[PDB]
Amino acid sequence: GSHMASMETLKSNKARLEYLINDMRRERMPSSFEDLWELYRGLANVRPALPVSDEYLAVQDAMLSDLNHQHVTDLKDLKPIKGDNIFVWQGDITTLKIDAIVNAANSRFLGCMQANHDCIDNIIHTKAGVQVRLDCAEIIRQQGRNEGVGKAKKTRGYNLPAKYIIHTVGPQIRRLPVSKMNQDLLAKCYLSCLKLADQHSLNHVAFCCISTGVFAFPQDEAAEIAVRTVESYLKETNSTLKVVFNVFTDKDLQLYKEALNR
Numbered sequence: 001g002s003h004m005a006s007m008e009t010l011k012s013n014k015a016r017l018e019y020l021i022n023d024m025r026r027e028r029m030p031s032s033f034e035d036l037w038e039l040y041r042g043l044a045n046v047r048p049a050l051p052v053s054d055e056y057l058a059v060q061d062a063m064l065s066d067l068n069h070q071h072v073t074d075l076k077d078l079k080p081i082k083g084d085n086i087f088v089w090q091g092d093i094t095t096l097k098i099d100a101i102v103n104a105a106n107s108r109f110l111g112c113m114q115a116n117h118d119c120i121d122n123i124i125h126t127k128a129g130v131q132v133r134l135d136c137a138e139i140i141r142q143q144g145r146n147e148g149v150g151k152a153k154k155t156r157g158y159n160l161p162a163k164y165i166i167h168t169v170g171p172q173i174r175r176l177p178v179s180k181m182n183q184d185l186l187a188k189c190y191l192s193c194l195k196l197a198d199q200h201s202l203n204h205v206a207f208c209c210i211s212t213g214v215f216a217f218p219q220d221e222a223a224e225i226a227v228r229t230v231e232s233y234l235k236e237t238n239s240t241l242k243v244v245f246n247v248f249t250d251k252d253l254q255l256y257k258e259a260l261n262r
């Protein structure tokens with residue numbers, strides 16, 4: 001659309017940010033969209049999983065839906081890289097129209113509560129909306145305990161173009177040469193996500209690159225386990241599931257291409 005329309009939407013979303021920031025400050029400022037967004041994000045990140053105002057949710061949803069759909073990529077417009085069911089796509093996972101995306105969660109399962117942390121959990125929760133945290137809190141409440149490694153739980157995607165978010169907890173990697181045990185645990189994450197998708201009759205799922213951070217699984221070995229586990233699953237089951245390997249960097253892109261090049 002026009003630059004003019006773009007500037008009006010920006011103005012509206014800055015006003016929505018100010019609104020949401022004010023609510024979170026008062027329940028218990030800067031000028032640029034960039035600075036407002038980081039202020040909002042930090043407040044959202046650290047907020048305990050308690051009920052919100054329904055007016056808050058109306059404003060939040062208007063903002064997040066708008067932001068997430070400004071430049072949507074539809075999986076139907078992508079072409080497979082291997083067979084007819086495996087894709088590698090460079091881009092923002094919160095802007096991909098697809099039945100499910102996979103979130104690398106933590107055991108507390110409420111998302112990232114580290115203000116402004118650069119991790120995929122933070123990104124997915126903050127773009128989807130607070131409902132994802134609230135729904136995860138209810139999953140944990142009904143379960144009676146925090147979430148183990150290598151499992152999968154589904155929530156709605158709310159403001160994401162993705163219909164659902166599949167949440168899995170991966171292993172922490174504290175030793176340089178990744179142990180066999182941790183390799184098996186990562187594979188088990190992939191397998192649980194794939195099975196959950198098929199169980200709920202989803203047509204497609206996207207996995208993300210591991211975000212770089214302390215004790216994150218090394219990218220190289222991660223890609224190899226991802227590809228190996230997905231390919232074994234699709235062979236052994238004759239699943240019609242389509243799988244997308246999402247990457248962000250040019251380097252991660254080439255990495256996954258190689259891993260699929262046999």
Ligand SMILES: [Zn+2]
Nearest residue numbers: 112117119122
């Ligand atoms: Zn985080």
